Design a binder for this molecule. Structure first.
Ligand SMILES: Nc1cc(-c2ccc(Cl)c(Cl)c2)[nH]n1
Length: 273
């Protein structure tokens, strides 16, 4: 069973998502993260290609967990009487982007460009797999410090991607779009672009732009740090009040600020090593 298959290490973190432990797969010593989610705390349920009742998080992770290293991979899952247990890949050494920005302050634009580009590629992978993350933020991004590779985590607030309106949201409010705040309605892709604007501002300024609902609704972006005109333009574009005024992923990646991105290994060599 699960208890013999894995060696439990220390608790890495806990919160709205549940409890995550460091671990080692006993067969090949592979580093893993063991996430526990109480059944009574799971509101969104779904079903696998076969039809088993599992948390939506398990459905979404299976849909995105293949080849590409931009999303944390689900290695296995187990059902207990009162909880679900998820075995996830664990990079080592690792640091989440929130901790990284807290320690190092506002990121140099070359570093933010590399990081932002990788988040965009990861989000595009999710969308191509029919998955909407809904909680893109610094806390949900892991940095593989040796490889300079970023990984999206916590699909616990996610949903299957659709072209119709979403009327439910349980992600982070300060990353949520004005249409959600005002009307309790949003479309997946344009809401994801808004959160990407919040994230980019956070990378280059060292803090999020808006705290209150009134600020989100006004959508007036003030720069507290020195940020290039091209970067400011891209941020203000992702943060357009009207969802239809926001750039598509293609338009973000073709933006003049996004040109000449460093490869992840070059990024680790210059900024992380
Ligand atoms: N899909 C996921 C992935 C994680 C996760 C959180 C924290 C760590 Cl240190 C790791 Cl390795 C993974 N939580 N939920």
């Amino acid at each position: 069973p699960l208890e013999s298959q894995y060696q439990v290490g220390p608790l890495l973190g806990s919160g709205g998502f549940g409890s995550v432990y460091s671990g080692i797969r006993v067969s090949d010593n592979l580093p893993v993260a063991i996430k526990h989610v109480e059944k009574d705390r799971i509101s969104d349920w779904g079903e696998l290609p076969n039809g088993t009742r599992v948390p939506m998080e398990v459905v979404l992770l299976k849909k995105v967990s293949s080849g590409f290293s931009g999303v944390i991979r689900l290695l296995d899952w187990f059902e207990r009487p009162d909880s679900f247990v998820l075995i996830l890949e664990r990079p080592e050494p690792v640091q989440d982007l929130f901790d990284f920005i807290t320690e190092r302050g506002a990121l140099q634009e070359e570093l933010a460009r590399s990081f932002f580009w990788q988040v965009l590629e990861a989000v595009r992978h999710c969308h191509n797999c029919g998955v909407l993350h809904r909680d893109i933020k610094d806390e949900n991004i892991l940095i593989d410090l040796n490889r300079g590779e970023l990984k999206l985590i916590d699909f616990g607030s996610g949903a299957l991607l659709k072209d119709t309106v979403y009327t439910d949201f349980d992600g982070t409010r300060v990353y949520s779009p004005p249409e959600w705040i005002r009307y309790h309605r949003y479309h997946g892709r344009s809401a994801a672009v808004w959160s990407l604007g919040i994230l980019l501002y956070d990378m280059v300024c060292g803090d999020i732009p808006f705290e209150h609902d009134e600020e989100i609704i006004r959508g007036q972006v003030f720069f507290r740090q020195r940020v290039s005109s091209e970067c400011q333009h891209l941020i203000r574009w992702c943060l357009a009040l009207r969802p239809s005024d926001r750039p598509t992923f293609e338009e973000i990646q073709n933006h003049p600020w996004m040109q000449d991105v460093l490869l992840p290994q070059e990024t680790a060599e210059i900024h992380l090593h």
